[PDB]
Coordinates of C-alpha atoms and ligand atoms in Angstrom, one line a residue:
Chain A
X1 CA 0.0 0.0 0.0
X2 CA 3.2 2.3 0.1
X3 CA 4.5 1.3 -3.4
X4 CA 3.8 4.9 -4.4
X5 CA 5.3 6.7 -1.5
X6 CA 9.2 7.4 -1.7
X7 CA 11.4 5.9 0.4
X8 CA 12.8 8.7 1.7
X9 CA 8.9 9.9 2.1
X10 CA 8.2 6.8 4.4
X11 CA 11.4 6.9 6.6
X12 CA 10.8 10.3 7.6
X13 CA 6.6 9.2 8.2
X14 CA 7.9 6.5 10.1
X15 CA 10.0 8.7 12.3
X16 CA 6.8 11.1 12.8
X17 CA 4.7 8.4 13.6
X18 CA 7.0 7.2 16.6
X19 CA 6.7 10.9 17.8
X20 CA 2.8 10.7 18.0
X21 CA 3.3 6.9 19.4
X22 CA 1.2 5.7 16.3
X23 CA 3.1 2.3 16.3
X24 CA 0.9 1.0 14.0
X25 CA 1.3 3.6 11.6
X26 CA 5.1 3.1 12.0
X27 CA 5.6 0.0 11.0
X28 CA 3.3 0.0 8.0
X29 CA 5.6 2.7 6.8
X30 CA 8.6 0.8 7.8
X31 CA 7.4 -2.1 5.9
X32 CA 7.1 0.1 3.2
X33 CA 10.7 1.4 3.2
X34 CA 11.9 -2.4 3.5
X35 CA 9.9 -3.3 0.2
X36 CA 11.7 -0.7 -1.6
X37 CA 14.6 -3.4 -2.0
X38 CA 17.8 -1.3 -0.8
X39 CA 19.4 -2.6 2.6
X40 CA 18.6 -0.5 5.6
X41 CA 20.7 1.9 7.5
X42 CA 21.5 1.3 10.6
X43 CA 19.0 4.3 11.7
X44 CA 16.4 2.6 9.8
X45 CA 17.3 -0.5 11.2
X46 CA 16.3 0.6 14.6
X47 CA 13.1 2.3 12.9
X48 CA 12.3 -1.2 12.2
X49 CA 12.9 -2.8 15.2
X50 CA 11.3 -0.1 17.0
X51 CA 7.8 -0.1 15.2
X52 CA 7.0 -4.0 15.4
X53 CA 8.1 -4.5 18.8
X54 CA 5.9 -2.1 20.0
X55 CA 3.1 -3.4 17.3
X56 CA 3.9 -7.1 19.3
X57 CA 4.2 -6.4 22.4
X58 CA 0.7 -4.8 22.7
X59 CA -0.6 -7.5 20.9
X60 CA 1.7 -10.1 23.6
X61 CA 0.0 -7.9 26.5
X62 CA -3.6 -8.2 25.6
X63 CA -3.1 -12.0 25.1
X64 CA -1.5 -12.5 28.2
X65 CA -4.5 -11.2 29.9
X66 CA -6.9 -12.7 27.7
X67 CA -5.5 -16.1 28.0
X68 CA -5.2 -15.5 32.3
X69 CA -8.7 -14.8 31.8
X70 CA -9.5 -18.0 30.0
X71 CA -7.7 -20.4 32.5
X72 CA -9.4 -19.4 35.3
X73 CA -12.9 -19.5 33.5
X74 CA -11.3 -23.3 32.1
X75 CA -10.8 -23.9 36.2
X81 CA -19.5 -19.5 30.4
X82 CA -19.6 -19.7 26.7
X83 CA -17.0 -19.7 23.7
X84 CA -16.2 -15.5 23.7
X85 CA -13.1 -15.7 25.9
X86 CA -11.4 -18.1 24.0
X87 CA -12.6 -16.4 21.0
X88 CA -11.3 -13.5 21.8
X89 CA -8.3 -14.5 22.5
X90 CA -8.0 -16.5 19.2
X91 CA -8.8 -13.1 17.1
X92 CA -5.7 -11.4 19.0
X93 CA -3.5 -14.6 18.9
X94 CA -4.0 -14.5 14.6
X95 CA -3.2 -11.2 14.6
X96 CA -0.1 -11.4 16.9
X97 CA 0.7 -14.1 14.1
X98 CA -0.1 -12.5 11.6
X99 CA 2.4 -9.5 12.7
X100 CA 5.1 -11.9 13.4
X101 CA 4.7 -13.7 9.6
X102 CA 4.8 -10.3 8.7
X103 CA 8.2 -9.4 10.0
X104 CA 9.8 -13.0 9.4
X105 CA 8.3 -12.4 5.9
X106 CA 10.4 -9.2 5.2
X107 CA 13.8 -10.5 7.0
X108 CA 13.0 -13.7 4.6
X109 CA 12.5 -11.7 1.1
X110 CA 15.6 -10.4 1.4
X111 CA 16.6 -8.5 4.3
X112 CA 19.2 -11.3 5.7
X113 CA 20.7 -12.6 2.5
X114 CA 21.9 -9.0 1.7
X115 CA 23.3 -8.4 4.9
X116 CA 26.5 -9.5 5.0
X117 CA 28.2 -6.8 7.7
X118 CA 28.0 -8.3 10.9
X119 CA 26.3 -5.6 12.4
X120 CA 23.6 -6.2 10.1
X121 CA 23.3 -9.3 9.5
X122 CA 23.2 -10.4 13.5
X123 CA 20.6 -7.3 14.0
X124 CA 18.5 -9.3 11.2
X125 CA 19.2 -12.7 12.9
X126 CA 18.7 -11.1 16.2
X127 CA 15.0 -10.2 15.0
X128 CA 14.5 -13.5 13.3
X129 CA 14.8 -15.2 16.7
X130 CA 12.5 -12.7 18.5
X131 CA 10.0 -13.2 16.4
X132 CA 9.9 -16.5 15.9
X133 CA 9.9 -16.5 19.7
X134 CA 6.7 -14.6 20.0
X135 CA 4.9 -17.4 17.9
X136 CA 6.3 -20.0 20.4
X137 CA 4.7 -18.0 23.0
X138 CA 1.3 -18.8 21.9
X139 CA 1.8 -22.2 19.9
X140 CA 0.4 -25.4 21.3
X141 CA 0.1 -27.8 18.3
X142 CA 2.4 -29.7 16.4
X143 CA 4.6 -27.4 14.5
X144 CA 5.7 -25.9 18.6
X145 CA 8.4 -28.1 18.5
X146 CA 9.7 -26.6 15.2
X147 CA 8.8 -22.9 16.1
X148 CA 10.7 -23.4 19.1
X149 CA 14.0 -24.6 16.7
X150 CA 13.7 -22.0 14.5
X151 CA 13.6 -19.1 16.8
X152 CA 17.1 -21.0 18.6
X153 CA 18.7 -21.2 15.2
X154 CA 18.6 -17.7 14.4
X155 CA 19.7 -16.3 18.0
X156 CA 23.0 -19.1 17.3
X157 CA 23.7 -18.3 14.1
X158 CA 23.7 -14.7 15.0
X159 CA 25.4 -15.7 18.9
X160 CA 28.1 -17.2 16.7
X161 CA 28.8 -14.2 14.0
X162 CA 28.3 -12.0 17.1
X163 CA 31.2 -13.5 19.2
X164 CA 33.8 -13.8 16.3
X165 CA 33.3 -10.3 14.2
X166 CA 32.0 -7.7 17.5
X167 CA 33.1 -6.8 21.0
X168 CA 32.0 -8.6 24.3
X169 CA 30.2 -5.0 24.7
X170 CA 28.3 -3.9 21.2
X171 CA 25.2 -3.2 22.0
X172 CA 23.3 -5.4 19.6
X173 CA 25.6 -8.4 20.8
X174 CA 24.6 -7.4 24.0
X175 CA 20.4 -7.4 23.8
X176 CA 21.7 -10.3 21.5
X177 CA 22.7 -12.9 24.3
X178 CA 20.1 -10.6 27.0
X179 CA 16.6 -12.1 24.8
X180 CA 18.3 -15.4 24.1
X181 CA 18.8 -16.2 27.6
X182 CA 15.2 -15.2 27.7
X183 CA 14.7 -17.9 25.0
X184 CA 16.3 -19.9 27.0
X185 CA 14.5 -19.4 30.2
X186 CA 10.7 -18.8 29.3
X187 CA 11.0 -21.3 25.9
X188 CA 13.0 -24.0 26.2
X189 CA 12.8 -24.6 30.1
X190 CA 16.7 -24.3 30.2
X191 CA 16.8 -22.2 32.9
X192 CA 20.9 -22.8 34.0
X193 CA 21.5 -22.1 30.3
X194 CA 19.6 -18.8 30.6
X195 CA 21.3 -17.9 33.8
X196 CA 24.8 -19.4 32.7
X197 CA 24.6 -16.7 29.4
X198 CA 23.2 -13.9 31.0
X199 CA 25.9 -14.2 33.8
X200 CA 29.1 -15.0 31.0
X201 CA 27.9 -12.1 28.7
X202 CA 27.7 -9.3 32.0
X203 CA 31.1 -10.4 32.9
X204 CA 32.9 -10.4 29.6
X205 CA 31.4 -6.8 29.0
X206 CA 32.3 -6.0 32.4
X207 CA 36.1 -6.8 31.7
X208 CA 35.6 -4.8 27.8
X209 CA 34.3 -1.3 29.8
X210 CA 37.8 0.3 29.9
X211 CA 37.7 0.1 26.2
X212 CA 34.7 2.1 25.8
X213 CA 34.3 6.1 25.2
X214 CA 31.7 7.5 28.3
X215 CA 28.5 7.7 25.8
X216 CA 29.6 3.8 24.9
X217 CA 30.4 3.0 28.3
X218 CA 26.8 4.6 28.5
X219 CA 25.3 2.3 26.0
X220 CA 26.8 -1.1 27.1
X221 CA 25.8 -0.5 30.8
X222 CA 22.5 -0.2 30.7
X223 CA 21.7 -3.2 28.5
X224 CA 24.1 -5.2 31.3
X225 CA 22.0 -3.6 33.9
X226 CA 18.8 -5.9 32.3
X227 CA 21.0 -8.7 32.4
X228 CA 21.9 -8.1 36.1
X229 CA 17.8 -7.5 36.5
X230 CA 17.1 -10.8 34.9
X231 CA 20.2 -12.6 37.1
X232 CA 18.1 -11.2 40.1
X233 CA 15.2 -12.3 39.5
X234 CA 16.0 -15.9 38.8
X235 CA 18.8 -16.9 41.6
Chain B
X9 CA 8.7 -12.4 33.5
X10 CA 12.0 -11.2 32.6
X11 CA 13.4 -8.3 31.0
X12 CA 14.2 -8.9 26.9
X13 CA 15.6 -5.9 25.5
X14 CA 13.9 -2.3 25.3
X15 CA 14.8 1.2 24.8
Chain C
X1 CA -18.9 -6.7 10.2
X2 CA -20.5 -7.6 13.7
X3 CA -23.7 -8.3 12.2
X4 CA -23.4 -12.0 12.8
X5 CA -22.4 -11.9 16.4
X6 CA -25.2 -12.0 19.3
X7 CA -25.7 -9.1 21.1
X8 CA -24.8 -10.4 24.5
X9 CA -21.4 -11.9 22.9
X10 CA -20.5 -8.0 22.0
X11 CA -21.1 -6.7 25.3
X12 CA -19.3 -9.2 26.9
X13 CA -16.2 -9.0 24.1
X14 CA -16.2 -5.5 25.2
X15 CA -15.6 -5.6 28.4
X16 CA -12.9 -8.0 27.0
X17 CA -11.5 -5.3 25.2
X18 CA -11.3 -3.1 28.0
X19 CA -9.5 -5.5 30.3
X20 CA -6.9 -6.2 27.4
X21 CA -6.5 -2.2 26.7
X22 CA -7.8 -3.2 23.3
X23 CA -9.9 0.3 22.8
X24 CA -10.2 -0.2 18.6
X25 CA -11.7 -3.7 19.4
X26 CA -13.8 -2.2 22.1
X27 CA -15.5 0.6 19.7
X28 CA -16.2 -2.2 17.0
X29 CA -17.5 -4.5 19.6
X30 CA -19.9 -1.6 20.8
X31 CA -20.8 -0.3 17.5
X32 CA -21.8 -3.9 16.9
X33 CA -24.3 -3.7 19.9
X34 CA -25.6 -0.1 18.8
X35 CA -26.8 -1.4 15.6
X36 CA -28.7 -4.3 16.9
X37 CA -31.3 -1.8 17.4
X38 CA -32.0 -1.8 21.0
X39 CA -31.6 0.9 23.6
X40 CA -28.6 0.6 25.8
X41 CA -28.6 0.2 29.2
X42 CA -26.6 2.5 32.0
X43 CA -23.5 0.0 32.1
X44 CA -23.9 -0.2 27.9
X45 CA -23.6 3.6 27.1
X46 CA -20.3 3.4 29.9
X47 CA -18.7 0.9 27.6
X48 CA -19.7 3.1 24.3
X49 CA -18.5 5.8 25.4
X50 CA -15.1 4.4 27.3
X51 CA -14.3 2.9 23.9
X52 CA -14.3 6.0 21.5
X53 CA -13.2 8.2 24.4
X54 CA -10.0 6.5 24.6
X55 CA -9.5 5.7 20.5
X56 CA -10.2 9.2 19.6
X57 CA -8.2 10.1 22.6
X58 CA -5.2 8.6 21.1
X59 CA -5.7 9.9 17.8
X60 CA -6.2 13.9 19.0
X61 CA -2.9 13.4 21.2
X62 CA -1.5 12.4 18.1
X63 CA -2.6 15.2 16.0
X64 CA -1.7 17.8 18.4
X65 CA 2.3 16.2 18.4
X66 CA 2.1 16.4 14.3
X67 CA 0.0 19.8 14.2
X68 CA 3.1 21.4 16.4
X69 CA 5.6 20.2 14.4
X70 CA 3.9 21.1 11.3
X71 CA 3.4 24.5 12.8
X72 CA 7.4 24.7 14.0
X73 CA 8.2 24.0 9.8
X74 CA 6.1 26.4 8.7
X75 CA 7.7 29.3 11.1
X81 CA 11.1 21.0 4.2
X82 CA 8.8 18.7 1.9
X83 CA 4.8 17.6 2.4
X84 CA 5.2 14.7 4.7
X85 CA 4.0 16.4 8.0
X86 CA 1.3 17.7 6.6
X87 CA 0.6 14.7 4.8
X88 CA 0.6 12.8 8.2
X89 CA -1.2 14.8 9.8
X90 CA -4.2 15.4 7.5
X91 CA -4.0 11.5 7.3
X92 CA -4.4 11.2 11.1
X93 CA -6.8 14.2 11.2
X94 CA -9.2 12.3 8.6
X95 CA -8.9 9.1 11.0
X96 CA -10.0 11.3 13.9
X97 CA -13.0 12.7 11.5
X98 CA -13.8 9.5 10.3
X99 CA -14.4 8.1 14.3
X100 CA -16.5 11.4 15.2
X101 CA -18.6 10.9 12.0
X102 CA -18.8 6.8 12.8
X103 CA -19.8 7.9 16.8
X104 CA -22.0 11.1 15.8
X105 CA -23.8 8.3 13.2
X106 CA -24.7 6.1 16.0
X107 CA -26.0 9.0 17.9
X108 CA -28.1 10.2 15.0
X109 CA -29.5 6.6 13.8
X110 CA -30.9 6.2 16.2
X111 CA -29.9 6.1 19.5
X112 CA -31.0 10.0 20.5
X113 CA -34.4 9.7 18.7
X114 CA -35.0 6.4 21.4
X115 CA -33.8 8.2 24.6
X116 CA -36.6 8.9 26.4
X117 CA -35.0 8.9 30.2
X118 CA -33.3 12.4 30.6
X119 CA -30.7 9.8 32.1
X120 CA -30.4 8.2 28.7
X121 CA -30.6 11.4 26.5
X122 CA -28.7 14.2 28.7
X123 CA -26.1 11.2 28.5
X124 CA -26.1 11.0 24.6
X125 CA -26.3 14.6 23.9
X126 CA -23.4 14.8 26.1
X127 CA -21.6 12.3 23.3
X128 CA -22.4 14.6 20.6
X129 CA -21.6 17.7 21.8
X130 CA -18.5 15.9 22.6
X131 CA -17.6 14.3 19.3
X132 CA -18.6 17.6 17.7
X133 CA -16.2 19.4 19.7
X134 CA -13.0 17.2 18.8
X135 CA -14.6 17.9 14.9
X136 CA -14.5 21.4 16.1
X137 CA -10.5 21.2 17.2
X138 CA -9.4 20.0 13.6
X139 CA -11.5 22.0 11.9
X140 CA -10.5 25.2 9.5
X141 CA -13.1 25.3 6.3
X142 CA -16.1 27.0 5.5
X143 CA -18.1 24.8 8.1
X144 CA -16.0 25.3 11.1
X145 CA -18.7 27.6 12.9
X146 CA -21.3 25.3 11.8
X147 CA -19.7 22.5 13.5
X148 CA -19.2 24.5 16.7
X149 CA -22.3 25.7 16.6
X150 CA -23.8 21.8 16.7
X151 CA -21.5 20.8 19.7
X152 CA -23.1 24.3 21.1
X153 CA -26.4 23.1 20.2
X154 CA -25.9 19.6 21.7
X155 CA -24.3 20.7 25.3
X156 CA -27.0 23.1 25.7
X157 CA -30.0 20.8 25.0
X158 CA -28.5 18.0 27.2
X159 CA -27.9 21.0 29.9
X160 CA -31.3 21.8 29.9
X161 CA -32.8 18.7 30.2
X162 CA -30.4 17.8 33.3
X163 CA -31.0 21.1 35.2
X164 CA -34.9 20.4 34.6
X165 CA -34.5 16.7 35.7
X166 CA -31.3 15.7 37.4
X167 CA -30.1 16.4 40.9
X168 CA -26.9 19.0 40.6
X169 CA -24.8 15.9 42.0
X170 CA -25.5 13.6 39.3
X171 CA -22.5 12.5 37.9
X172 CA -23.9 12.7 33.6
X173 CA -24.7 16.0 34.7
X174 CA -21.6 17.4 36.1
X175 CA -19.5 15.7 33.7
X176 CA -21.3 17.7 31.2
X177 CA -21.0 20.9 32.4
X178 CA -17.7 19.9 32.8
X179 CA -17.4 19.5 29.4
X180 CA -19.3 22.1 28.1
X181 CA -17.1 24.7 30.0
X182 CA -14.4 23.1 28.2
X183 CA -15.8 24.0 25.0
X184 CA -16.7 27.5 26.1
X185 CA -13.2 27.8 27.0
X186 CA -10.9 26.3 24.1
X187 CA -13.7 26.1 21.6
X188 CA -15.9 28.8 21.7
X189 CA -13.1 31.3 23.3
X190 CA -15.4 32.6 26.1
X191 CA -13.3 31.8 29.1
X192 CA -15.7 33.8 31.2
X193 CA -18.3 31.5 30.3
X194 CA -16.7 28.5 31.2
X195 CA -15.2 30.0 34.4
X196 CA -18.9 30.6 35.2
X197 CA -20.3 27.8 34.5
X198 CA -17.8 25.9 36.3
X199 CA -18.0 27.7 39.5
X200 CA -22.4 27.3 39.3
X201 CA -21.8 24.0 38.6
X202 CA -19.4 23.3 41.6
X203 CA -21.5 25.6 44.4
X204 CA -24.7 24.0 43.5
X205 CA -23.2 20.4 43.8
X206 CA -21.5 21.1 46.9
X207 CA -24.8 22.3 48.7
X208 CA -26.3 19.1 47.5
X209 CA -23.3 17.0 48.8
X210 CA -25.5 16.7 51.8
X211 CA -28.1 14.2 50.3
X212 CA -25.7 11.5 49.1
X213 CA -24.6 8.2 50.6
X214 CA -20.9 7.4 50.8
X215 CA -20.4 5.9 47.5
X216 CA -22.7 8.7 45.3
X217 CA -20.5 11.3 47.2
X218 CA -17.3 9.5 45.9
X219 CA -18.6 9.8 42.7
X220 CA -19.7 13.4 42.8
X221 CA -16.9 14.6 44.7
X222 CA -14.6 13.4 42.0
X223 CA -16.0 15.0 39.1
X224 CA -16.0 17.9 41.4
X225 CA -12.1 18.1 41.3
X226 CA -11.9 18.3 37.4
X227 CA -14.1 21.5 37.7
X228 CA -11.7 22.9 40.5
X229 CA -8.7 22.0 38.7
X230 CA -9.8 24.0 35.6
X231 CA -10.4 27.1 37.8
X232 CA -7.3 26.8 39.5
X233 CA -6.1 26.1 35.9
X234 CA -8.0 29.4 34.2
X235 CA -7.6 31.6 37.6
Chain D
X9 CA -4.9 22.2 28.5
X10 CA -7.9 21.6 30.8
X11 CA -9.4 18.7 31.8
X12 CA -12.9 17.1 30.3
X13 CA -14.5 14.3 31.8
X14 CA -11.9 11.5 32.6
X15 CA -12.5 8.6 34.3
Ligands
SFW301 C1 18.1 -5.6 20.1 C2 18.8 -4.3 20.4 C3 19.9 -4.2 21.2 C4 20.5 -3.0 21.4 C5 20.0 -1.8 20.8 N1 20.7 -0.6 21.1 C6 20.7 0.0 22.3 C7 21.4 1.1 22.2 N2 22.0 1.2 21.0 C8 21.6 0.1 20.3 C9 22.0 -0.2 18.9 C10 22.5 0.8 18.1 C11 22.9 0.6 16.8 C12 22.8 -0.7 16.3 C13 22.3 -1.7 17.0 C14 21.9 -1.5 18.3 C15 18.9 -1.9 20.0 C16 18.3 -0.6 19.4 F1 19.1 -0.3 18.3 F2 17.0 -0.9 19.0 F3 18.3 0.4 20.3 C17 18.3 -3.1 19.8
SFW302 C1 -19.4 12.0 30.8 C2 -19.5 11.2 32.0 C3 -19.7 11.8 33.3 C4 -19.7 11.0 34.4 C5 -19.5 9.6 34.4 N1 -19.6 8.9 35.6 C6 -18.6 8.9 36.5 C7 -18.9 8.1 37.5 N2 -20.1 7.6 37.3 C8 -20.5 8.1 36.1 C9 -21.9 7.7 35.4 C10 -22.5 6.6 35.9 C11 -23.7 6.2 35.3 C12 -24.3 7.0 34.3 C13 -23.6 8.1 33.8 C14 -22.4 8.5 34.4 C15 -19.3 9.0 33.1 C16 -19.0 7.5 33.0 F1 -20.2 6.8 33.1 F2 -18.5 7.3 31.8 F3 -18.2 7.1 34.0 C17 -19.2 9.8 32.0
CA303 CA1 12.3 6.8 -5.5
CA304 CA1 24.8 -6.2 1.5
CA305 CA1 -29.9 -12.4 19.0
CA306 CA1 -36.8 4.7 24.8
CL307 CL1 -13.9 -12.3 18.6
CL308 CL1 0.7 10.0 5.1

């Protein structure tokens, strides 16, 4: 629906819509940009990143209540779990969306680290949305496609970026989510989130005071998460 | 439930 | 598109809606209800209105953030105009949809100067946020209807409702709004809002513990706007 | 700005 709007046009519309907190609205225009077929700053990167999660995570909210909502009434009629099923297909329907434009082509042309694990990065976060509402029998499968892209990008990550860049950093921070809330590997989740805050740690003399800035307070949600499970 | 990553 | 859906089913995916924070689903839900044809009851017309309050709340916040930056350019290409006039014919296009419900036919049935004052309240209302955006040839005319709208529902609830009741003061709350940032008459709405807030408190007397909580609370927003305007 | 009706 933006094939007639220039790119230039939509990145700028995206970056007003953040400003009035039209998420929505973002990430159409974001989408947009991305199906113009030129690779994405890293500006426009964020832009990206920014729109859906916010899309997704008001869409993870509203089914988290609606599904506490249908448990206890499962402890009335079919409008509950209805409901829930018209937020869950949209929630899905966002996440294809996203997987759909890192699929055709956003990954294969990124081949600069930063990039490419950003992309990767994304990949696994969404596919990890979708595992928070599957239950049939593609689950299994959801669940190994959302690890293969956070290890493919863990991997590029640790051999081309520093223990403290900030997207290696979120990086490793939502895999040992992964980890914790997905694959009931809770040591694994602690044992990452605990290796990555210490080899950052030992990388902060390296760091300018706006990167120092940067690095710290994505550590500081790792330290949040260490907290809150040991 | 845990902190992923946000701005 | 809710045609299919029973009554009871929309009311209850409302309230739905409103736990989730799912206000766009909430106003379909409730439009839904309106056109089955039947009156609402008290707790109905809380949902209607709660719904388009907050989605048309969003949208004027948004306006306002892209209608100051448009006015800080103006002191660069089309786009902020462009967004904005999109967003300001979103916001149009929910007034029109509410003001349509009002019209067809949910005034015409409201018989109970609880159901009517409370409706007439809605329109004057939904003309006023028309009235905020507006800058053609029928920007009096719409100001003129909210005008016409308040003022019939104020009549009707100083003929039939207590000065406490809460439809009532919310509505000469709201109508000193207008007078004040619509209709530029700040001495109006000063006015009104100090009758309104006398005459309530010297009915305070008659009220039980939970209908003075009520009253007491609309109350506040008529002091804050005289502490605001004074 | 003032304040309409909220709940
Ligand atoms: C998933 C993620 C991780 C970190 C960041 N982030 C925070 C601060 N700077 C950055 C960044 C800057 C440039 C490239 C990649 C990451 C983000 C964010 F970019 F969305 F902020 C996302
Ligand atoms: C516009 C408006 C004014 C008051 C109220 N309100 C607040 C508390 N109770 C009520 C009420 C109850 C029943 C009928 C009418 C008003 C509302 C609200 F109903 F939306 F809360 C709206
Ligand atoms: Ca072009
Ligand atoms: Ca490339
Ligand atoms: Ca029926
Ligand atoms: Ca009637
Ligand atoms: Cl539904
Ligand atoms: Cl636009």
């Amino acid at each position: 629906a933006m094939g007639s709007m220039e790119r230039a046009s939509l990145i700028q519309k995206a970056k007003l819509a953040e400003q009035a907190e039209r998420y929505e609205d973002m990430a159409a225009f974001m989408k947009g940009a991305v199906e113009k077929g030129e690779e994405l700053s890293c500006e426009e990167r964020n832009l990206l990143s920014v729109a859906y999660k916010n899309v997704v995570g008001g869409q993870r909210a509203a089914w988290r209540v609606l599904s506490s909502i249908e448990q206890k009434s499962n402890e009335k009629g079919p409008e509950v779990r209805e409901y829930r099923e018209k937020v869950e297909t949209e929630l899905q329907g966002v996440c294809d969306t996203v997987l759909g434009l890192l699929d055709s082509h956003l990954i294969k042309e990124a081949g600069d680290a930063e990039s490419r694990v950003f992309y990767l990065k994304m990949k696994g976060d969404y596919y990890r949305y979708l595992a928070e509402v599957a239950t049939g029998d593609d689950k299994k499968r959801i669940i190994d496609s959302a690890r293969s892209a956070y290890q493919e990008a863990m991997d590029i990550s640790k051999k081309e970026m520093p223990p403290t860049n900030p997207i290696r950093l979120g990086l490793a921070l939502n895999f040992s989510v992964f980890h914790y809330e997905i694959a009931n590997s809770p040591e694994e989740a602690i044992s990452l989130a605990k290796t990555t805050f210490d080899e950052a740690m030992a990388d902060l003399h390296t760091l300018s005071e706006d990167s120092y800035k940067d690095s710290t307070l994505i550590m500081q949600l790792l330290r949040d998460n260490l907290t809150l499970w040991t | 439930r845990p902190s992923s990553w946000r701005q």
